[PDB]
Design a protein around this ligand. Structure first.
Ligand SMILES: O=c1ccn([C@H]2C[C@H](O)[C@@H](COP(=O)(O)O)O2)c(=O)[nH]1
Ligand SMILES: O=c1ccn([C@H]2C[C@H](O)[C@@H](COP(=O)(O)O)O2)c(=O)[nH]1
Lengths: 316, 316
């Protein structure tokens, strides 16, 4: 079944892991080095044994492709995945006036009185960013994010480089190129980043008329992130394969440090109780092809039939 | 047996490959995405079923660690692996006076009259680089090479960054860091390089008292390069594990596009006839620890017992 590789990753990390400490202080069972392989021609790797919001995987990807960096497009789409970043910044500015929210996303999960002041100032932020133009530009832009590392890699002679736009040229004219790589890992910026890239780099490869993509993710959360990531990329593999006029091959997911947090144990353990169902089917607008200018409407997820979503706490 | 993972890579590429064209025009059987895993505590992954020159894997690595880039240290050690690069450059300079050696390393393998003029001007070059200081600096420096990408990553504010020297700091003070990565893939320089890095990036990871390293090599030659590379890195894993005071774990080799050239088929096919022998054993100078200042003498390969070396032509 499509997703078995994924469930097998979790058993392996559970009944074969190794406990180790980490940045957030919850704890983890971890393993190092792991390849997993999905055959997109067989289906779409959106988990069935747990309900994943394609809405979120979808709007975030298109944000990326525009080479955006402002949370404002996401908010525009009710997508709040990246707020806690922009916010934190806003919070540590004296233009921020009020409740010194230090470790806001820490205590808010142990103290319900704070979970209200916090979430209040958040809708302050997100509404301001939504409405005050000068704010959206000042506090809404994140800066170095996948979109800018994909389509605006800052050089040392003052210019921007469109990495993703370029590799796509090479796929048409040199489908056999073994240098078709996009990297988001930048040495000079790496030591001044809230969170240096998890999805470090990817490489496409055109087998006989088919396009494949391999990902190297240095740090993974089997439970909360891996289910999302598998789809951002299986989606990206189609989008590109669309523009270049190629059929679709495989998605090869490779991990450095793959972890399962302590307090997620009971959930993954329950999720394994389920028996996978037939995977959905990605449908794309056959009229439009210039992927950089695709829009939500242009994608369709046919036949998705998932098990209830599983409640789980962010380990922080 | 230690090296089986490697031999199994070659069978897989042979009795399960896919033919595809490429840069040099020989031809290949290829596969995409592959992880292989060696347990350095069990031995040293220098192939036994074929004789590999540890002398070469060794001097090239130390060159790297010094953050050198001049072929002059290698020549100093009879190591000629990188000459054809420096040379080519020298050749396309009008200071080069004489035999316009276009595609020298092409025709020299189909025409034995040329294989003599060529190899003559080569010893011209290598002797000049060995002796004429201003030449060694002018034509002997390669520039962007593993040594400079490891220890002098050019930033956009005029400075050099010691990537490898830094990760090593982090291993001591944050052995559990999941951001311990060195990358040699640079977007802005990539489109003006004779050969952009094969060994794209590596990441260390400290499991319970043990150090592990995973490599992402975008393009491999199962026959001629993979046997060398497995050892540069298994060697590097020990060297680092030496300085940081850690035990040694595993070497995880991950490939994007792994190929076997057409005209190498008969050789690999013969090499598989052999039955692996017990692997050698790396011994390091217990007195010295500052790896950046190690020297040949400080390494010892105990108990190596290899099958005859196998003759093979460079596909070009
Ligand atoms: O798409 C994503 C984003 C984040 N994370 C996780 C992985 C780790 O839990 C943490 C990053 O580890 P450090 O870099 O902070 O060590 O965020 C994912 O798994 N997938
Ligand atoms: O350490 C090394 C150096 C080179 N190569 C090979 C791999 C390919 O044969 C060629 C590089 O492929 P392209 O980047 O040129 O497409 O050089 C190796 O396998 N290992």
């Amino acid at each position: 079944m499509l997703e078995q590789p994924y469930l097998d990753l979790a058993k392996k990390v559970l009944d074969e892991g190794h406990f180790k400490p980490d940045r957030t202080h919850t704890g983890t069972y971890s393993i190092f080095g792991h390849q997993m392989r999905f055959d997109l021609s067989k289906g779409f790797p959106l988990l069935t044994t747990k309900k994943v919001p394609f809405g979120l995987i979808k709007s975030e990807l298109l944000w990326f492709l525009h080479g955006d960096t402002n949370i404002r497009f996401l908010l525009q789409h009710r997508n709040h995945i990246w707020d806690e970043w922009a916010f934190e910044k806003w919070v540590k500015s004296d233009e921020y006036h009020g409740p010194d929210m230090t470790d806001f996303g820490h205590r808010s999960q142990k103290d319900p009185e704070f979970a209200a002041v916090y979430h209040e100032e958040m809708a302050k932020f997100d509404d301001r960013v939504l409405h005050d133009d000068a704010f959206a530009a000042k506090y809404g832009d994140l800066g170095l994010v996948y979109g800018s590392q994909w389509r605006a890699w800052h050089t040392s002679k003052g210019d921007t480089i469109d990495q993703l736009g370029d590799v796509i040229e090479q796929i048409k004219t040199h489908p056999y190129s073994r240098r078709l790589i996009v990297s988001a890992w930048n040495p000079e910026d790496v030591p001044t980043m809230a969170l240096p890239p998890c999805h470090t780099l990817y490489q496409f490869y055109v087998n006989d008329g088919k396009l494949s993509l391999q990902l190297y993710q240095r740090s993974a959360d089997i439970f909360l992130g891996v289910p999302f990531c598998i789809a951002s990329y299986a989606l990206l593999t189609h989008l590109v394969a669309h523009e270049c006029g190629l059929e679709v091959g495989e998605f090869i997911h490779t991990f450095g440090d793959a972890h399962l947090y302590v307090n997620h144990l009971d959930q993954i353990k329950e999720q394994l109780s389920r028996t996978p169902r037939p995977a959905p089917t990605l449908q794309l607008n056959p009229d439009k092809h210039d992927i950089f200018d695709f829009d939500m409407k242009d994608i369709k997820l046919l036949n998705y039939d998932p098990y209830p979503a599983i409640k789980a706490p962010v380990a922080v």
